[model samples]
Target chain A: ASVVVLATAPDEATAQDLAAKVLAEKLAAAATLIPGATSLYYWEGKLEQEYVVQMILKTTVSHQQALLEALKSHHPYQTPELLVLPVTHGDTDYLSWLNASLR
Target chain B: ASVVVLATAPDEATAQDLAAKVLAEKLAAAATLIPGATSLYYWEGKLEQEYVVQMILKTTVSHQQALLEALKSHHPYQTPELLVLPVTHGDTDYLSWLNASLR
Candidate 1:
C-alpha cells in the first residue's frame, strides 16, 4: 500500500532539510515542500499562530514507522504535525515510478 | 469529514484549467496544481513515461462524487489519476478555512 504523508515544519528551510534526509534514506520516493502555510491551532490551551511549511511525501506503507521516527528525530518541533492519508488509487505508471524510486 | 483528492492531467495547463473549473463550480474549497510530474508505468508490457500535472483539492466529503465527475469529464486522460485521501487531522484554523471556503 502507498501513502502520502503530510507534515508541518516551522519554515521552508526546516522542511527542506527534513525532506532531503527522508529522500536520501529512501523513506520516501519524493518529498514536495509547500511554503507559506499560515497555521492557527490551539496548543496547550492557547491559540497559536505561525507560518509553517507543509511537506507532502510519496512513499510506501512499509516505511511508515521509519519515516515517522526520522521526522520526529530530525524535526525541530516538540510535537510535529504529522498525518498519513491512504492513496486508494493512482495511475499505474505513476505508482510504479514511485515504487521504483524507493528502491 | 474532509478529504484531499488527487488527480493528474496531461500538462500543467490542462490541470490548471480543470482546477479552475472545479473551484469555480465550488466542488472544492481550494485546488493546488503541482507541475512537472513524470509518470512511469507499465502498459501492455511496456514502460511508458509522460509528464503530467498533479492536482490536489481540499474539500468536504459531501462533494466527493461531484468532484470525481467534474474531474473525469474535464480531464484529458480517459482514466484520470483520481483518488481521495482522508484528512485525518489538520490545524484547526486551516480546516475551518477550508470548510468556510466550501460554503
Candidate 2:
C-alpha cells in the first residue's frame, strides 16, 4: 500500500534538498515540494507560527519507517510533521511508475 | 467534511483577481484552502506554500473562512506551484466525486 507522507522544512532549499535525498535512497519514488509556507501550530501551547516549506513524499506503506528515520535524522524541527495520508486511489500510470521503481 | 484546496495565479494579476474570486465564491467542495495548514493545530492550519496543483477534489463552507483570509494575506499568484496537502480523512465519497452536494 502506498501513502503520501507530509513533512515540512525550514525553507525551500531545505525542502528540495531533503526531497532529493529521499528520492535517491529510493525510500520514495518522488519527494515533492510545497515550498515556502507559513504554518501556525501550538508548540509551547500558544498559537506559535513559522515560515516553512512542505514535502509530499510518495512511497509504499512498507517504506514508512525508513523514510521517517531518514528524514527525522536529517530534519531541522525536533518533531517534524510526518503523517501518512493514504492515497486511496490515484492515477494508474503514476502508481505503476512508483511500483516499477520499487523493483 | 474537510478537504484540501489549491489555488494558483500565473502572476500578481492572478493572485489579485483570478484566485481571490475563486475562493470568494466558495469554489471547491472541501477547503478552498485547508485550515490547520495555517496552525491552530493539532492539525487544521493554513497552507501557504508555492504551487499550482494537487487533488483534493472537493470544497466546503466549513473551511471558507481561512481560504478567504489566505487570499487577504498574500501575493501568492503566478510562477506556478500551488495545490492541496493532506491528512484530512473526510467523507471519502464526498471527495472529488462532484456527487450529491454540488450546485
Candidate 3:
C-alpha cells in the first residue's frame, strides 16, 4: 500500500543531511526534504518554539517497520519526529514506483 | 506519541523566518526545519512550480490544532500545505515525553 511519512530535524542542513543519508542508504523509495517550520508547544513545563527541518518519505506499508527502525538508530534528537500517514490518493505512476522500489 | 506533520510556504526566507520565530518562542518540545522544496500542484486551475519551504512538525496529536492555527495566520499562501499523520510506533521514552509535554 502507498504510504507517506514525516521526519523532522532541528535545521535545514541537518534535515538535508538526514534525507540524503536515508536516500543514499536506500531507506525509502524516494524522499523529499523541505525547509521552513515554526512549531509552538510545551516542553519541560514551559512553552517552547523553534524552526526545524522536515523530511517527507514515500514508501509502502511493508517497508515501514524497517524504515522506522533505521531512523531511530540514526536520528540526532533527544526525540526525533517520525510519523506515517496513509496515502489516500496519488498519481498512479508514482504510486506504482513507490510500491515497486520498496518491494 | 511522536507526530509528523507538514506545512508549506511560498519562499525560503519566509519559511526560515517563520521557523526561527517558532523556535525562538519555544513552540514545541523540539522541532527541526529544513529548506529546499519544489511543489507541483494545481493552483487556481493551473499547474505551478516553485521553490517552496516545507516544514515537518513533530508533536502529539493534540498539538495539531494550535500548529495549524499558527500556520494559517502567518502562512503566505491562500492555501498552505498542512497535513497530519498518526504515529503508530516510537521509542518509549520519546513517546512518553510527547504525551507528557503536550498534556
Candidate 4:
C-alpha cells in the first residue's frame, strides 16, 4: 500500500529543498511542491493565518516512518504539520512508479 | 474523521475555479491550490509527464460522497484524477474547522 504525506513549509524554497533531500535519500518516490498556500486555523482560541508552501510526497507504507523522521529532522519548524493520508486507489502504472521510486 | 481530497487540473486558472466553486458550495471548508506540479506516470507502458495544478481540499467523511460527485460533475476531465486521502491525525482545532465547514 502507498500513502501520500502532507507537510507545510514556510516558503517554496524550504519545501523544495526538503522534497529534494527526501527524494535523494530514497525515502520517498516523488515530491510535489505547491506554493501560495493560505492556511487558516485557530491557535489559542484565535484564528491565525499563514502563507505557506504545501508539500505532497509519495511513498509506500513501509517507508512512512523513516520519511516522517527524516522530514522532522530537516524541517525548520519545531513541530511541523505532518499528516499522513492513505491512498485508497490510483492508476496502477502510477502506483507502480511510486512504489518503485522509493527504497 | 476529516479528509483531504487530491485533484489535478491542467492549469492554475482551472484549479482555482474548481477550488472556489467547491468552497462556495460548502462541500469543503478550505481549499489550497498548489501550482506547478510535474506529474510523471506511465501510460500504455510509456513514461508520460504532465505539468498540472494540484488542488488540496479539506472536508469530512460525511460529505465525502457528495464532494466526490460534485467534483466529478464540475471537473473537465472525463476521468479526472480524484483521490481521497484519510487524515490520520491533525490539530484538534483544525479538524474542528474542517468538519464545521461542510454541511
Summing lDDT over every window of 10 consecutive residues in candidate 1 chain B, give the lowest-scoring window.
B39-48
Candidate 4 root-mean-square deviation in Å: 6.8
Q: What is the lDDT of residue B23 in candidate 3?
A: 44
Q: Tens-digit lDDT track for model 3 on B1-103?
A: 4566677777767765665555444343454444566889886999989887656566666666777677677777766888876777645566676566544
Candidate 1 — which residues are off by over 4 angstroms?
B1-4, B8-14, B20-54, B57-83, B86-103
Cα shift from native, residue B21, model 1 (Å): 7.5
Supply the DockQ value of model 1: 0.20
| Per-residue lDDT over A11-96 for candidate 4, one digit per residue giving the tens place of the 0 to 100 score | 87787678767777788876666677788989899999999977777888899999999999999989999988788654445567
Q: Please give, for residues B22-84, the per-residue lDDT of candidate 4 as tens digits.
A: 888899888887676655434454444567888878888888767777787788876566677
User: How well does candidate 3 score on lDDT at residue B41?
Assistant: 82
Q: At residue B2, what lDDT does model 4 achieve?
A: 81
lDDT of 2 by residue, B15-87 (tens): 4454445435555433233222221000122222332333233444454445534443443422222233343
How does residue B94 of candidate 3 score in lDDT?
A: 65
**lDDT values, one for every candidate:** 0.76, 0.55, 0.67, 0.78
Give model 4's docking category: incorrect
Off by over 4 Å in 2: B1-52, B59-98
**Which lDDT value does model 2 have at B22?**
48
* Candidate with more favorable, higher DockQ: 2 or 4: 4
